[PDB]
């Protein structure tokens, strides 16, 4: 199970479906404006839900698995917001994990397995769109 991702994706279904359907044919080397917007819109919705979960402590601290997995998201947030570091785009940091959730969404809904070309293009979009989401 990946219960934190499921909870956030399940509250992002409109954005998730729009992203999956928009990127079905996508060439990451030549994205349309609508493909960029669909990716940014899904990432922004995931970000909003994940930030809320972390800041509000929406977690069962007695659940050994859920609490550890929450702490990894919290660690990523602290490595983005300056409390531990200010590097939101670092490998395995906040936006990298959001890009991974987007890859997971495609895998678990339509059976497509995207790799470095898609993941790197997502990270480039996030760098362009979301620099101001953290100080």
């Amino acid at each position: 199970s990946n219960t934190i991702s499921d909870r956030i994706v399940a509250r992002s279904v409109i954005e998730a479906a729009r992203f999956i359907q928009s990127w079905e044919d996508a060439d990451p080397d030549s994205l349309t404006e609508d493909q960029v917007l669909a990716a940014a819109g899904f990432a922004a919705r995931l970000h909003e839900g994940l930030q809320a979960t972390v800041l509000q402590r929406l977690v069962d601290e007695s659940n050994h698995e859920e609490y550890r997995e929450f702490k990894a998201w919290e660690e990523a947030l602290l490595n983005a917001d300056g409390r531990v570091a200010s590097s939101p785009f670092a490998d395995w940091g906040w936006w990298y994990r959001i890009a991974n959730v987007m890859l997971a969404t495609a895998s678990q809904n339509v059976g497509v397995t995207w790799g470095s070309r898609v993941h790197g293009r997502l990270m480039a979009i996030f760098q362009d769109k979301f620099k101001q989401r953290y100080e």
Binding site: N2, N100, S107, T113, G115, S116, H119, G120
Partner: protein
């Protein structure tokens, strides 16, 4: 082959039915389309079934329909007219629902209905399942205005074609001629063996037709291989019929034709060497069993004691089974999820059998009656041809129970060919064992006798195994004596009734129980206490320090011991390993650690297993030889310190498989099975007991230290509903179990247990809540036309719980020297890079690793031995199965793959 002529006729109907189902235009449009891909529409097989139903009904006597079919002139307007449309509107009578076809016709429809998939039904009712195939409706098909369009765009059905019509007429005439055949067929359709045979025949012919390259309009799919559509459906129907003719002939052929391994010098010969007596006795019983057994079938139990190597007994049974003709055929199916090349190789070495003679199913099989239909050079065919095929129980089980596809067909054919041997571990939970029993039952009926080496088998499970063959025997005779191998003696019972078999089981159990009652020569049980991995880890280290001093070998002033740390789950083992790495060895000691589990890539894991096997052979006065042996020599040269501990930290698969004898072990408890395996390892090869403790057991399952409940699961005999009152281990195991711990506890047949009174007791009860005793009875599945549907399978699924896909460290398509973590998709791999995190492990003072593997070196070795490209061959040989996890894995060369959190 009494039923063969009828089977062939039935098979010859099905392709024609399928083409008819094919006809509606929506399908033609889809073949035309290329893209975007169209929905179904409603399965083609289902449409074909409707077409078959429409001509005949309702309601027509089998004879009348055959007469219409057999006569050339008709017609064919009324038949063309007849078929119902579900749309326009709402409900329409379900085909075969009632008062429809003559039953033979229904069987034909099922055969036709079957090919796309076995039927699926939302209703789980027991009564509905027994009736089958009557309940099969829209849900079974798995399939509107689009449907009407599919029916329409037309144009021109079969029975217009000159060649197709004539063949059908001839078939009808043959059906009319065949004495007694129509009525019998109508009653029979239900019989499981017949249904299975028909399904098998249909899958192969269809595959052959698909493989092969005048005015007719209707047609088969194209685009995957050359653009546009190729061929015509009617030609396809003819081809299917031709194949059907040929498949029946081949089945009749195989026993004399089929590749067999026979008359091996070693298996026949008696074993001079000490401690081989039980196998010899079992072999001698073999002649009597064979005389009884081939005519009547064979159900054997090799219950030779755990911690004693099994190869000889199974080999003897196989040799015993057929003599001297048709030697030799059998398959050794191991109760592991994955078979490594090394394990198979070891089994082969045991049997003194050439690799070509023995095939390993690793799916690549390492080394034609079905050859003409079959691929000339293909793995499934190779597995069939080999005199013995090695692979595992799970794949065969999946083939026997398949939701869909030819692969199911090949698997069934494989199960069919001579007789399938299990190993014990597979059932796990009284229920999973029940699914295994169902597969075994389906298997016997094909006529293979399967022998179970029940070192740890529960009596009830054995009874269930005995019953399935019994149903199978009834099926098989139309188309039982059990022998208990023992070190002391083997007893064979020729018993008609399962209850009779059980008592015979009880009697056999009594003698074994008496042997157990003799105090066990080898094995001490320790109850200790853990004060999470690190807290446990320290305790484990202390235990290891204690055991080596107690149990070690000295040569020329130095002392070596070998220990086993068994953990239940990969993550916990990884944590323990990490704790060990940060900490050193204790003062004065050198610790060598080898991490062994199922996570690691398959080639590397196999290499590690082979190394362990080479290291862990133990013989009297073998300490000096061990010192001489290269790893030992290296350790001695390397470091001044006298005292060396070579230690394997392992999971359940390693525990389950490996002929390794260990000086001591520290074991995390998962059940009677964990205990038995540990005891065998504890005394693999060496006579005599120090009488000091050499085996240490822990208090609450690691989940229990977490406090997770039920404490024993995954694998736990325990289930949440069947709760055990007290978590603690010390209460759970009886003082007698504690002393001279031996299978005896498992072998019973122990009464009367208290739900929370005995951990073993709990296991027996749960296992029975499994078997005959949300529980669709296995007996019910045996009784009824389960074979028709996938309902029983859906009810009790094999490999329950999510299954990780399959991944590998792949050398890049362009550059051999760069590696990418990759996921197997569907005939190709997607970039893994993004997700997977790679982690170093710190090394403790006076600590190092052993029995490790460099991945690149392993790949090079694979390339050298198999003449493959590094990337392709390393794929083939470098898969690791993993439950999908969004953020990926950490990877360390020694430790394999661990999740994230």
């Amino acid at each position: 082959w009494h039923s063969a002529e009828d089977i062939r006729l039935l098979t010859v109907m099905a392709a024609l039915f399928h083409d008819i189902g094919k006809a509606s235009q929506a399908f033609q449009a889809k073949l035309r389309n290329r893209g975007k891909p169209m929905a179904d529409a409603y399965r083609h097989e289902w449409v074909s079934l409707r077409l078959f139903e429409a001509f005949v009904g309702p309601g027509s006597s089998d004879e009348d329909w055959l007469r219409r079919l057999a006569d050339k002139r008709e017609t064919g307007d009324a038949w063309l007219s007849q078929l119902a449309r579900d749309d326009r509107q709402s409900a329409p009578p379900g085909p075969f629902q009632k008062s429809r076809l003559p039953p033979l016709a229904q069987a034909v429809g099922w055969l036709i209905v079957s090919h796309h998939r076995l039927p699926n039904g939302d209703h789980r009712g027991s009564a509905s399942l027994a009736r089958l195939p009557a309940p099969i409706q829209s849900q079974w098909c798995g399939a509107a205005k689009e449907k009407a369009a599919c029916w329409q765009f037309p144009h021109g059905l079969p029975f217009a074609s000159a060649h197709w019509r004539a063949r059908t007429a001839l078939c009808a005439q043959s059906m009319l001629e065949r004495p007694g055949l129509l009525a019998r067929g109508p009653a029979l359709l239900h019989d499981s063996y017949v249904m299975h045979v028909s399904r098998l025949i249909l899958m192969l012919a269809d595959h052959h037709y698909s493989s092969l390259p005048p005015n007719f309009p209707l047609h088969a799919n194209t685009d995957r291989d050359s653009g546009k559509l190729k061929q015509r459906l009617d030609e396809h129907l003819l081809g299917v019929a031709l194949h059907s003719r040929k498949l029946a002939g081949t089945l009749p052929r195989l026993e004399r034709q089929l590749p067999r391994l026979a008359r091996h010098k070693g298996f026949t010969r008696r074993v001079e060497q000490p401690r081989f007596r039980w196998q010899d006795k079992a072999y001698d019983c073999a002649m009597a069993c064979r005389e009884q057994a081939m005519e009547h079938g064979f159900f054997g139990l090799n219950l030779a004691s755990t911690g004693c190597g099994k190869t000889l007994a199974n080999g003897r049974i196989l040799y015993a089974l057929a003599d001297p003709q048709r030697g030799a055929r059998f398959s050794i199916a191991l109760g592991l999820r994955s078979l490594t090349l090394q394990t198979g190789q070891a089994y082969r070495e045991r049997l003194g059998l050439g690799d070509d003679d023995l095939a390993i199913l690793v799916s690549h099989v390492h080394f034609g009656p079905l050859r003409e239909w079959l691929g000339r050079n293909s793995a499934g065919n190779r597995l069939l041809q080999a005199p013995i095929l090695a692979c595992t129980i799970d794949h065969l089980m999946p083939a026997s129970e398949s939701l869909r596809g030819g692969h199911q067909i090949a698997p069934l054919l494989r199960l069919m060919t001579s007789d399938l041997v299990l190993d014990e571990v597979d059932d796990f939970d009284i229920d999973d064992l029940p699914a295994l029993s169902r597969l075994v039952h389906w298997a016997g009926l094909f006529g293979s006798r399967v022998l179970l080496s029940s070192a740890t088998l529960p009596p009830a499970l054995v009874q269930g195994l005995f019953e399935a063959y019994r149903s199978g025997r009834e099926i098989f005779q139309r188309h039982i004596r059990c022998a208990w191998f023992d070190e002391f003696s083997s007893q064979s019972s020729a018993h008609g009734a399962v209850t009779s078999f059980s008592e015979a089981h009880a009697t056999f159990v009594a003698q074994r129980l008496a042997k157990l009652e003799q105090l066990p020569p080898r094995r001490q049980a320790q109850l200790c206490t853990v004060h999470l991995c690190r807290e446990l880890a320290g305790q484990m280290n202390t235990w290891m320090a204690d055991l080596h001093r107690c149990h070690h070998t000295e040569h020329q002033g130095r002392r070596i011991s070998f220990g086993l740390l068994r953990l239940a789950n990969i993550e916990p083992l990884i944590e323990l390993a990490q704790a060990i790495l940060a900490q050193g060895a204790p003062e004065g000691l050198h610790v060598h650690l080898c991490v062994y589990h199922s996570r690691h890539p398959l080639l590397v894991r196999s290499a590690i297993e082979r190394q362990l096997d080479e290291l862990l052979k133990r013989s009297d006065d073998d300490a000096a030889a061990l010192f001489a042996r290269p790893t030992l020599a290296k350790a001695l040269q390397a470091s001044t310190e006298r005292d060396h501990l070579f230690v394997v930290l392992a999971s359940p698969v390693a525990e389950v498989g490996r002929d390794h004898d260990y000086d001591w072990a520290i074991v995390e408890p998962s059940s009677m099975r964990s205990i038995i395996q540990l005891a065998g390892r504890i005394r693999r090869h060496r006579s005599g007991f120090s009488g000091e403790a050499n085996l240490y057991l822990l208090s609450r399952n690691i989940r229990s230290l977490e406090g997770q409940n039920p404490a024993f699961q995954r694998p736990g005999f325990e289930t949440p509903d069947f709760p055990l009152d007290s978590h603690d281990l010390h209460d759970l195991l009886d003082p007698a179990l504690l002393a001279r711990i031996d299978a005896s506890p498992r072998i019973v047949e122990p009464f009367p247990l208290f739900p929370r009174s005995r951990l073993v007791d709990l296991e027996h009860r749960r296992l029975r809540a499994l078997m005959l005793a949300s529980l669709l009875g296995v007996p019910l599945w045996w009784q009824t036309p389960a074979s028709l549907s996938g309902a029983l399978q859906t009810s009790q699924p094999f490999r329950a719980g999510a299954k990780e896909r399959c991944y590998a460290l792949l050398p890049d398509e362009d550059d051999e020297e760069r590696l990418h973590f990759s996921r197997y998709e569907e005939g190709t791999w997607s970039n893994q890079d993004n997700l997977l995190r790679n982690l170093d492990l710190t090394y403790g003072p006076r600590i190092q690793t052993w029995g490790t593997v460099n991945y690149r070196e392993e790949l090079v070795a694979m390339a050298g031995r198999e003449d493959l490209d590094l990337r392709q061959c390393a794929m083939r040989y470098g898969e690791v199965r993993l439950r999908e996890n969004t953020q990926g894995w950490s990877y360390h060369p020694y430790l394999g793959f661990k999740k994230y959190n």
